[PDB]
Amino acid sequence: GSHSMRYFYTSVSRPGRGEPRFIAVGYVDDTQFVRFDSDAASQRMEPRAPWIEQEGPEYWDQETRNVKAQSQTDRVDLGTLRGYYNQSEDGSHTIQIMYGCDVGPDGRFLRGYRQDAYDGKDYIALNEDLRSWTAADMAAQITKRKWEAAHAAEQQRAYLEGRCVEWLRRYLENGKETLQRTDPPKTHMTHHPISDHEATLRCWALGFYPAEITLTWQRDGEDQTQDTELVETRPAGDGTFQKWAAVVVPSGEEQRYTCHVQHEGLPKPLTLRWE
Amino acid sequence: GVTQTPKHLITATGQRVTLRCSPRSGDLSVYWYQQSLDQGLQFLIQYYNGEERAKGNILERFSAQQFPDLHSELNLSSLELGDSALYFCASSPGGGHNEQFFGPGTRLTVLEDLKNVFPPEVAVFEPSEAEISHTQKATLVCLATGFYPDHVELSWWVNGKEVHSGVCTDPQPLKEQPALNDSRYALSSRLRVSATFWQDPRNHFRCQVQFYGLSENDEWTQDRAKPVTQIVSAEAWGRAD
Amino acid sequence: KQEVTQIPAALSVPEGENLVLNCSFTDSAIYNLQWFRQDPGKGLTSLLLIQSSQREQTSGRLNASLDKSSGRSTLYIAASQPGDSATYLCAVRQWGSLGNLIFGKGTKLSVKPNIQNPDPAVYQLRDSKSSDKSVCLFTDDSQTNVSQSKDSDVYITDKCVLDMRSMDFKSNSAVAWSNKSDFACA
C-alpha cells in the first residue's frame, strides 16, 4: 500500500528554569524509529526501531548534528516570536514543527508536508503545491517574507520530493519484516446492563496494525451515530493498536444491533453480533 | 563588517596562537576556513549563537569557541610549518545556507626559529633621461630587498598622500637565492607620471613598505635590531638634472 | 566524496572579450552553488548564489548557469576588463549539512589590457641616495615574454600593468637588477 515518513519537533521555553526543552521523533507509518531529547544524558539521535540500527556511524553523527542544530534555531525562533506577539519573558511558549512525504504503492512521491505552530495554533504551513506558504496571523506574515527571500519553499520541495522519498524507500526495504506487515484485529463484543431497560454493547478491536481502522454500528442494516460512543485509536505498547465503539441499546433488542470492522489486514469486512 | 585580529602573525614551531574574529552586528553564525597553497580553502568549524553547530576536518590540536557577544577565538596548538596559511572567519545573519560574509583573514607563518626574520631595505631609483626625452613620461622604481618572510604591503606616497593611479606592484615577491630553503625575498614596484610632473621640484615621491614581523612579546637575543613590525621608506625629489 | 574542480586553473583573455570559467562537482546532492571573487591576500566577495531549482542567475556582466545532476556550473563575464583580473572561487553546500562551503582550488583570471600603440625600449634607473647602485627597466604589447635569468646573481621580475587614470594610458613594465657593479641593460 501507500506509506509516509514524518518528523515531529517540540520546543518549550522554561524561562528561569534553564534552556528550552527540545524533543524530536521520527515516524515511518505509525511506527517510531528515531528520538532526540535535549534533557537526556546521551545528547545523540537514538534508535526506537530495530531496522534503523542498520545505518552506519555517518548517519547517527549527521542526524545528531542536524537535530541539535534544529533546537538551536527553535531557541532563537522562541525569542523572535515572543517579540512578534509582544509577550513577556515570564511566559512559557511552545514551537511545534511537522514535515514529511507520502509515497504510492510504487514508492514514487504523492504529497509533501511542512507545518509550523506557535502555542498549539497554526503559524506557517507549506501549501500542497510546495511553492508557496500560508501564514495564519500577522506575526507569521513576517516569517513568510524571510522564507520567500531565502527560497525556503524550493529547498523544502527538493527535500520532500527527493531525500525524504528515497530515505522512506530505504527504511521500508530494511524494515519490510515489520513496516509492510498487516496484523488483523482480534474482535469481540462485551455487554453491560445500564439499568433494567437499557444495556451498552461495546465492539472491540485488539492487536491490529497499521492504526487505520473503521468501527461503525448498524440497527436492522441502517447506520447508527445516535447513542454511539467512540474512543481515539490507542497504542498497545508492543507496536499494535486498540480501539472500541459502544451503543446504548434497549434491553431485549441486543440482537438487532451489529458492529462493522473495516481494516487492511482483514480479507473482507467482519460483521459482529452479540451472543 | 567582519574584523579578524591579528592581521599577520609570525610564530615558531611547537608554540600556541589565538586568532580573534568579530562577526557583523546582529550575525548569529561564525564559520572558520583555512586557505593554504597545498589544500585550498577548507572548512575547520562553525558556531551558531554561542554553540558549536558543525565540525570540518579540524585537527585535535585545533580548538575554537563562540562567546556570548558572538565573537569567536580559534586556538592553534603544537604549530607545524604546514599550518602556515590564511585563516578566514565568515559571519552569517542566520545559519549560513545563503550568505557568508568573509573577514580580511589572519595570515599565519610558522618558521623553525625567528632567527631568519629580517626587515626590508627600501630604495627609490630615479627615472632615466633616455626614458624622459623619448616618451615624455618618467617611471620611478622602488626595490624592497632582504626581507623574510614575505609579509610586506608596499604603497607609493606623492606629497604625503597615497596614489594608486599609474602604480604597478609585483603580485608575488621574488626569492633572492631560489636554491636556499629560508631564502629572503625582494619586491619591486613602479610609479609612472608625466615628465613635467617629475621635473617639478615641489613634488615629493616616497615609496612606503609596511613589514609585519615579531612582537614586543617575542624573545630576541641577537646584536641585529629586533625585526619588529615597522614601516621602511625611501625618498626622491623633483629635479631638472 | 564531494570534489569541486575548476579547469582550467589559469585563463588569460584579451581585454573586452567574453570569457567562460568552469566548475565541476562529483555529488549532485547540493542546496546551492556560490561563485566568489578573491583579490590577492584579501577576503572573498560573493558574486552569484544559484539555488538548485534555478538554471540561471544574472548580475551586471556576471552570468552563472547550474545543472546539479550534470555536476556543472559556468560563470560568464561579458566585455571583460583589467579590473576583473582576480582568482574566481567555486563552492557548493551539501544536502544534510548545515551550510558550510566546499571550495574548488579556483581559476586565476588574467584579463590582458589592450595596448593601443606599443613602443618597446629598455632603460637604466640610478639610485637617488647610495653610490653606484642601479636597475634596468623594460617598459611598453601585452604579448611579449619575460624569462627568469639562468644566471645566479641576476634577478628579473615578472611583468605588471599600470593604468594612468588621467591620460587613460596602460603600460606593461618589468624590472631587473644584479649585485655585480656595472650591469648591461641592452
Binding site: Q62, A69, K146, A152 | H97 | -
Partner: peptide
C-alpha cells in the same frame, strides 16, 4: 533523514 536547511522565523 532529517531536513537541515534551517531558516530563522
Amino acid at each position: 533523514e532529517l531536513f537541515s536547511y534551517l531558516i530563522e522565523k
